Design a protein around this nucleic acid. Structure first.
Lengths: 83, 82, 82, 83
DNA sequence: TTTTTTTTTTTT
DNA sequence: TTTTTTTTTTTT
C-alpha cells in the first residue's frame, strides 16, 4: 500500500496503470503539462512509451472530463456497469 | 450549447469534441465497446479517424475513471485549475 | 462453371469457394491487402466471416506460394493425387 | 542448406515458414491429412500451435490451388508483384 | 464474446 | 502506409 502517493516512471513522472501494458501519466514537455494515455513496452530492463496513445493538453483533458457523464450514460445503455 | 448531449457521425456512433480536431468516441468492434480518444483529419470533405490516439476497453476506461482524482490533484499541484 | 472467374460479396470483395462454407477472399484493411482463408457462417440470411481462419499479408501469401511444390510433393508421398 | 528435405516440428510433422510466427505444415489427424496454415507461439522452450489459423482437408487445399491464378491476377490488379 | 500483419515504439 | 484489447492458443 501507499496512500497519498503514486508510482513514478524512470523519467520521474507519476503514472497510474489502466491495463498491464497501458498507463495514464502526467508529463511536462516544452514547459507544458500533458496527460498521456499510452501503451508501454519493455525493452532493456526498462518500460518505454509506445507509439499507440495520445497526449492531451490540460484543456483537452478538461474537455474530456466534461464529457464523462454522457459517455457513462452511453456505456450503461450498452449494458455496462459504470459507477 | 448542448450540455449532456453528444454528436453522432455518419456511422451512427456517438462522439464529444475535446479540441478542434480531437474526439473521444464510442464504437463497437468485434462485439466489444471501445472508447477512442483520437486525432481526426480531413479527406474528401470528410473527417476521418487518424493514427494518433488510443482505443480503451470499458475496463480500461473505468480504470482511468478511478485515477481521475489523483490526476486532478497532481495537475492542481502543478498549478492548474480543475 | 466459371473457370478463371470469381465471386463477389455485398462488400464488393472477391472470393473463391474451397468448400461448402469455406472461402479464400481478398480485402483491404488499414490500406493493406489481406488474403483470408476462413470459415463462413449464416446469420439473418447472410453469410458472415467466422472465427476460424487466417488472414495472410501479401508477403505471407507469396511465401506460401513458394512452399506449394514441397507441400504437393509431401502429399503425393502420403498417397494423394495433386 | 538442406535441398530435398524440410524442417520438422516437435510432433514429427513437416512445415514451411511463411512469417517469423506463421507456418504452413502437413499433419495427420484421425487418419486424414490436413494442410495447416497457423500462427505459432513460444512457450516452455517449445513452439506451439496458436488459435489463429485453419486446417484444410486435401480437397479443400486442392480447391485452393485451383483459385490461385485468379487470386494472383486480383493481387496484381491491386499493384502487387506476384510471379 | 464468429475476418484482416509486422515492425517500431510520448508529450498541443 | 491515418480507429477499436487481452487472454489463450491445431487438424473436415
Amino acid at each position: 500500500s501507499n496512500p497519498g502517493g503514486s508510482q513514478v516512471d524512470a523519467e520521474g513522472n507519476p503514472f497510474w496503470e489502466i491495463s498491464d501494458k497501458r498507463r495514464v501519466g502526467i508529463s511536462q514537455f516544452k514547459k507544458m503539462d500533458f496527460i498521456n494515455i499510452r501503451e508501454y513496452y519493455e525493452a532493456g530492463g526498462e518500460m518505454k512509451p509506445g507509439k499507440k496513445g495520445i497526449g492531451l493538453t490540460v484543456d483537452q483533458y478538461t474537455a474530456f472530463l466534461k464529457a464523462i457523464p454522457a459517455i457513462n450514460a452511453e456505456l450503461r445503455s450498452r449494458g455496462h456497469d459504470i459507477t
